[PDB]
Amino acid sequence: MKFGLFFLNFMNSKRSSDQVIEEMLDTAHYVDQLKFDTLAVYENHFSNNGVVGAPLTVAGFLLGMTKNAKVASLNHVITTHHPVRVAEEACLLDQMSEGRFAFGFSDCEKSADMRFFNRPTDSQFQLFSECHKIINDAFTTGYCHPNNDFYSFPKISVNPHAFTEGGPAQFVNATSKEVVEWAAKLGLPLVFRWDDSNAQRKEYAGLYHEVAQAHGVDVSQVRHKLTLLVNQNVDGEAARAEARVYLEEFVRESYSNTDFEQKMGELLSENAIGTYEESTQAARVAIECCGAADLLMSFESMEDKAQQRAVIDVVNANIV
Amino acid sequence: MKFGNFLLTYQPPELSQTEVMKRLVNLGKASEGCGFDTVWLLEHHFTEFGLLGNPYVAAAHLLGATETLNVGTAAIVLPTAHPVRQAEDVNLLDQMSKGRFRFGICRGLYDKDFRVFGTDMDNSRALMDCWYDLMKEGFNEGYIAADNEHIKFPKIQLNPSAYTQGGAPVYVVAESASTTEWAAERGLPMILSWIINTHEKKAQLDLYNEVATEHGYDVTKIDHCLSYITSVDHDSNRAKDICRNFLGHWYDSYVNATKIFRIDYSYEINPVGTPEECIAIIQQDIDATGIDNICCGFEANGSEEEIIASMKLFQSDVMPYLKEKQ
Ligand SMILES: [Mg+2]
Ligand SMILES: [Mg+2]
Ligand SMILES: [Mg+2]
C-alpha cells in the first residue's frame, strides 16, 4: 500500500483561512522528506469547510515548493467548470513538473454550486461526461473538438500538450453509482471518500467490480484510493471531541438531510480517530471494506502542531 | 529602480512544446539571480504564439519555487473566465506567496478565446470593467454578489481572504485611450507597450495623469512599467539581426493567432544593441516619463543559454547605470 496526505483546509472563526493555508504549506514541506508519496488538495467553495476553490492552482504552488511527493487535485469538480480550462491546467502542471501531478477529479456534490455556475442539474451526468470527454481527448491527443449539447466550438490544440504520454494519471471520486459505473466501464481508478460510510464505500467497490466484469474490463491492476481522517490521542475521548468540533459544520452543510448525531457518530468511529489502537483498527477496517490500494490521510483536525507532527511521525515509521 | 523579466512562452519554429515549457520553468527560476525582482507571464490559448493559457497556475509554480521573487501576469484576459473563480485564484496566490503575486489584466485581443470560452468579444470592455468590480468587491469585503446584465449569482463568501489589503496589486495593459482612462479612474499602474515611442509613452501618461489627478491619486507613486523587447550584445548588429529575425517569425505567429477560425522599427525604440545603446534608449524613456520599473523580454535572444547570457549582460552592464528621473 502506498500512503499520502490530503488537505481539507477547513477554517473557522478562530483558525482563519490565512492560517490554514500556511499550515498546509508547512505540512507539505514537512512530509516531502518522509515516506508519504502524494499530497492531495480538496476543492470547496463558499463555506468554511474548505478554503481552496482552485486545487490546480494550489497544486502548482505545492509542486514548485517540493521535490519528492506526487501532488494531486483530490476532487477537482469538472462539472461546474469549462473543460478546456481544466485540460490546459492539468497539462500545464504535468509539463511544469515533468509528470509529478495526478489528476483527481469529481462530479459536483452540491446542487447549489451547479446553480451558482448556471449548470442544470437535470442533465448533470451528461454534462460531467461530456466534460471528461473533452479533457481526455486533450490529454490523449493534444486536441479537442466538441459539438454537443453543452460545448460546441472548432477543433483546437489544448496547450501545452501533456508531458506524460496519455496525460497525467487520473482518478475519480466515488460520489454516485452513476459515476462509479461510468468509471468501471472506463477502467478508471476511484477515490473512496472519508465522509462516506464504510457500507457505502463497500457498496461502491462492489458495484465497480461487478460492472467491470460485466463489461469485461480488466481492472486487476487498477489501484483505488481511500481518504480517511486521522486524529490520534492517548486520550481517545479527547481525540473524538476535537474531531467533532472540527466536523460539526461540515456535517450540517454536506449531510443536511440525515440525522446529525448519527452521522457524526459514524464519522468519528469509522475514520481513523481515537487512541492509536482505535485509529489503526478503524483504518484497517475501512481499507478492507473498500479494497483500496492507496491510503490518503488528513491530520488537520489535531490543533496541537507538535502532537500532529508526532502522529504523522508514528504513521510514517509504521509504513517504514 | 525595479526590474521585471517577461516570459511569453512563445514557441519559435525550432523548439518543441516540451522544450518551450522546460525553458519557461528554467528562465523563471534564473530571474532573481540575474537581478530581476519580478517575473511577468503572458496568457495565450491554442497556438504557438504563447503556450501558457493559465498564468495563475504557472505563477503558483514559480512562487512556490521561490522566496522573495514577485510573479505577475501580463496579463490575464479578464473577460474569458468566471470572475469568482479568478478571485479565488488571486487570493490563493496572494496567501500562498505571502503577497508576491502581481495581478496584471487586459481586455483580450483574440476572438478565438471568446469563441471557445463562450464570451462575447464585442463586449470585452464592459466585461473587463464588470469582472474587475466583482473581484475587487471580493478582495475588499470577503464576499461577492452579482445581479447585472452580464452576470447574476447569489452573495457568497469568497475564500480564502486576501493577504494584501485590497487584494493583490493590479496592473493594467492599456491598449486604448479609454483603457488608459479606466485605469486612471482607479489609480492603477499601467504596463506600457514596447511598440510605441517615447513621445507616445509620455502622451499616454499625460492622459492618465489628468484623470488620476482629478480623482485624487498621487500620480508620483503609481508603479507604471516600461516594457521592452531586449537584446544586449557587445556586437550591436548581431543583437539587431537576431531581434529582427525573431520578430519575423513571431509577427507571423501573431497574425495566425488572430485568424485561427511598427513591430518592424521596434528594434529602433527598444534596448536592442550594445549595453550602452540599451542604456541610452531606456534612460530616454525614464527621463520623459518618470517611470522607475523596467520590464524586459529576452526570449528573442535564442537558446536558453543565450537568453540567460543576454540577461546577465543587461544585469552587469545596463542595470547599474540607469538613473531615476531628475
Ligand atoms: Mg474517560
Ligand atoms: Mg529538439
Ligand atoms: Mg513608485
UniProtKB/Swiss-Prot annotation, chain A:
Q: Which reaction does it catalyse?
A: a long-chain fatty aldehyde + FMNH2 + O2 = a long-chain fatty acid + hnu + FMN + H2O + 2 H(+)
A Gene Ontology CC term for this entry? cytosol
The protein's matches in CDD domains, at most eight in alphabetical order, are given as: Alkanal_monooxygenase
> Which InterPro entries would you find in this protein's record?
Alkanal_monooxygenase, Bact_Lucif_Oxidored, Bacterial_luciferase_CS, Luciferase-like_dom, Luciferase-like_sf, Luciferase_bac/NFP
**Which terms under GO biological process does the entry name?**
bioluminescence
From the Swiss-Prot or TrEMBL record, what is one GO molecular function term? alkanal monooxygenase (FMN-linked) activity
Keywords (A to Z) from UniProt: Flavoprotein, FMN, Luminescence, Monooxygenase, Oxidoreductase, Photoprotein
Instruction: Tell me which EC number(s) this protein carries.
Output: 1.14.14.3
Q: Does the keyword Oxidoreductase apply?
A: yes
- Mention any Pfam family matching this sequence: Bac_luciferase
Task: Output the SUPFAM superfamilies linked to this UniProt entry.
Answer: Bacterial luciferase-like (SSF51679)
SUBUNIT field:
Heterodimer of an alpha and a beta chain.
> What's this chain's function?
Light-emitting reaction in luminous bacteria. The specific role of the beta subunit is unknown, but it is absolutely required for bioluminescence activity.
Q: Which family does it belong to?
A: Belongs to the bacterial luciferase oxidoreductase family.
Matching entries from PANTHER family are given as:
BLR5498 PROTEIN, LUCIFERASE-LIKE MONOOXYGENASE
**Record protein name field:** Alkanal monooxygenase beta chain
Name of the gene this protein is made from: luxB
UniProtKB/Swiss-Prot annotation, chain B:
**Reaction catalyzed:** a long-chain fatty aldehyde + FMNH2 + O2 = a long-chain fatty acid + hnu + FMN + H2O + 2 H(+)
Query: Which GO BP terms apply?
Result: bioluminescence
Keywords, A to Z, come to: Flavoprotein, FMN, Luminescence, Monooxygenase, Oxidoreductase, Photoprotein
Asked whether the keyword Lipoprotein is assigned, the reply is no
Name any GO cellular component annotation: cytosol
User: Quick check: keyword Oxidoreductase in the entry?
Assistant: yes
| Listed InterPro entries | Alkanal_monooxygenase, Bact_Lucif_Oxidored, Bacterial_luciferase_CS, Luciferase-like_dom, Luciferase-like_sf, Luciferase_bac/NFP
Q: Which GO terms describe its molecular function?
A: alkanal monooxygenase (FMN-linked) activity
Q: Which SUPFAM superfamilies does the UniProt record give?
A: Bacterial luciferase-like
EC number(s) recorded for this UniProt protein: 1.14.14.3
Its biological function?
A: Light-emitting reaction in luminous bacteria.
Q: What other facts are recorded? A: The synthesis of this protein is regulated by a complex control mechanism that has been termed autoinduction. In fully induced cells luciferase comprises up to 5% of the soluble protein.
Complex and partners: Heterodimer of an alpha and a beta chain.
Could you say which protein family the record assigns here?
Answer: Belongs to the bacterial luciferase oxidoreductase family.
Question: This chain belongs to which protein, by name?
Answer: Alkanal monooxygenase alpha chain
Species of origin: Vibrio harveyi
Name of the gene this protein is made from: luxA
